[PDB]
Scaffold this active site. Sequence first.
Site, PDB file in Angstrom:
ATOM      1  N   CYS A  18      23.377  42.171  49.003  1.00  0.00           N
ATOM      2  CA  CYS A  18      23.123  42.969  47.722  1.00  0.00           C
ATOM      3  C   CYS A  18      22.136  42.322  47.028  1.00  0.00           C
ATOM      4  O   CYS A  18      22.330  41.128  46.717  1.00  0.00           O
ATOM      5  CB  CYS A  18      24.580  43.254  46.991  1.00  0.00           C
ATOM      6  SG  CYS A  18      24.069  44.218  45.543  1.00  0.00           S
ATOM      7  N   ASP A 129      37.744  53.842  46.287  1.00  0.00           N
ATOM      8  CA  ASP A 129      39.024  52.962  45.778  1.00  0.00           C
ATOM      9  C   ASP A 129      39.002  52.285  44.399  1.00  0.00           C
ATOM     10  O   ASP A 129      37.684  52.158  43.907  1.00  0.00           O
ATOM     11  CB  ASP A 129      39.049  51.510  46.665  1.00  0.00           C
TER      12      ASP A 129
HETATM   13  C1  430 Z   1      29.093  44.462  47.842  1.00  0.00           C
HETATM   14  C2  430 Z   1      28.716  44.866  46.393  1.00  0.00           C
HETATM   15  O1  430 Z   1      28.377  46.348  46.149  1.00  0.00           O
HETATM   16  C3  430 Z   1      27.912  46.829  45.029  1.00  0.00           C
HETATM   17  C4  430 Z   1      26.956  45.959  44.015  1.00  0.00           C
HETATM   18  C5  430 Z   1      26.648  46.713  42.848  1.00  0.00           C
HETATM   19  N1  430 Z   1      25.944  46.377  41.689  1.00  0.00           N
HETATM   20  C6  430 Z   1      25.082  47.106  40.963  1.00  0.00           C
HETATM   21  N2  430 Z   1      24.792  46.065  39.886  1.00  0.00           N
HETATM   22  C7  430 Z   1      25.464  45.033  40.125  1.00  0.00           C
HETATM   23  C8  430 Z   1      25.357  43.967  39.157  1.00  0.00           C
HETATM   24  C9  430 Z   1      26.476  42.555  39.505  1.00  0.00           C
HETATM   25  C10 430 Z   1      27.101  42.616  40.617  1.00  0.00           C
HETATM   26  C11 430 Z   1      27.206  44.076  41.325  1.00  0.00           C
HETATM   27  C12 430 Z   1      26.078  45.286  40.985  1.00  0.00           C
HETATM   28  S1  430 Z   1      27.378  48.315  43.080  1.00  0.00           S
HETATM   29  C13 430 Z   1      28.098  48.065  44.477  1.00  0.00           C
HETATM   30  C14 430 Z   1      28.844  49.350  45.246  1.00  0.00           C
HETATM   31  N3  430 Z   1      28.146  50.295  46.025  1.00  0.00           N
HETATM   32  O2  430 Z   1      30.109  49.371  45.129  1.00  0.00           O
HETATM   33  C15 430 Z   1      29.612  44.295  45.329  1.00  0.00           C
HETATM   34  C16 430 Z   1      30.951  44.849  44.892  1.00  0.00           C
HETATM   35  C17 430 Z   1      31.525  44.395  43.699  1.00  0.00           C
HETATM   36  C18 430 Z   1      31.222  42.889  43.135  1.00  0.00           C
HETATM   37  C19 430 Z   1      29.890  42.260  43.723  1.00  0.00           C
HETATM   38  C20 430 Z   1      29.171  42.885  44.629  1.00  0.00           C
HETATM   39  C21 430 Z   1      27.861  42.189  45.259  1.00  0.00           C
HETATM   40  F1  430 Z   1      27.870  40.860  44.778  1.00  0.00           F
HETATM   41  F2  430 Z   1      27.749  42.234  46.214  1.00  0.00           F
HETATM   42  F3  430 Z   1      26.788  42.905  44.664  1.00  0.00           F
END
Ligand code: 430
Length: 251
Positions: A18, A129
């Site tokens: 990501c 979820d």
């Molecule tokens: C795997 C990942 O999936 C994500 C990340 C998203 N995102 C959008 N703005 C952000 C700012 C900070 C961290 C994440 C952010 S959205 C999204 C989705 N489709 O669910 C994820 C999921 C939870 C926490 C962190 C992450 C990441 F670090 F991989 F980005």
Amino acid sequence: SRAEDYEVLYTIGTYGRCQKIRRKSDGKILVWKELDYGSMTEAEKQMLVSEVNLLRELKHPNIVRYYDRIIDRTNTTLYIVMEYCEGGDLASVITKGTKERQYLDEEFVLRVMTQLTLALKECHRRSRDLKPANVFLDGKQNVKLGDFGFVGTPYYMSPEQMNRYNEKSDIWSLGCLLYELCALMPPFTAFSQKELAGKIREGKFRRIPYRYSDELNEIITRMLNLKDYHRPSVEEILENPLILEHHHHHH
Ligand SMILES: C[C@@H](Oc1cc(-n2cnc3ccccc32)sc1C(N)=O)c1ccccc1C(F)(F)F
Ligand SMILES: [Cl-]
Ligand SMILES: [Cl-]
Ligand SMILES: [Cl-]
Ligand SMILES: [Cl-]
Ligand SMILES: [Cl-]
């Protein structure tokens, strides 16, 4: 709709990778998910195409927005372009409260409850979820539900989704999530899933900390009723006197 149209600022997390990106034309901040479908069957890529088209079908202020999809057939990489949420996910917020040993404000919990309840209502209407790691904060106090696209214990598993799911099972999960926000722990903890299952069927948990009003404790407690039919509906939750205009989304 081409990779060169964006510039990567940096990696946020590593099914793929990501990255925080910037659209060259207007300098808009976004993120994309980076997938390598090189090793996928035509079938696996077919299901992936239809999953991605379902992401496009949902535009709601409390649901993480899809913008674009870029295929790079040279690196066999697929990029899903989405909204950047500068405040990150809820898992982090909870972890940060556990360690800094500081509870979240009732006003914050009220915001999550109101806006997640509206995200839910929007999902049901079209028939994700509800865990902290899949709930995001933007820069303006807005809450957005994302989508996830064996080892772990299912703390948020509802009684009915345990003994073989309806819209009221979603309410239980929301209950578990608001609960963990308040107590910095899930309503039911255990070392195994059999133990967990045990505690869930007894339906007993601690009151959320005393800094939270009886009213907030009551509603969260109702969501965690063993009987799905005693859990409040999306509509009954929003009718709660606790929930005020300013708890809703704002641009
Ligand atoms: C795997 C990942 O999936 C994500 C990340 C998203 N995102 C959008 N703005 C952000 C700012 C900070 C961290 C994440 C952010 S959205 C999204 C989705 N489709 O669910 C994820 C999921 C939870 C926490 C962190 C992450 C990441 F670090 F991989 F980005
Ligand atoms: Cl919004
Ligand atoms: Cl604490
Ligand atoms: Cl009980
Ligand atoms: Cl307590
Ligand atoms: Cl409902």
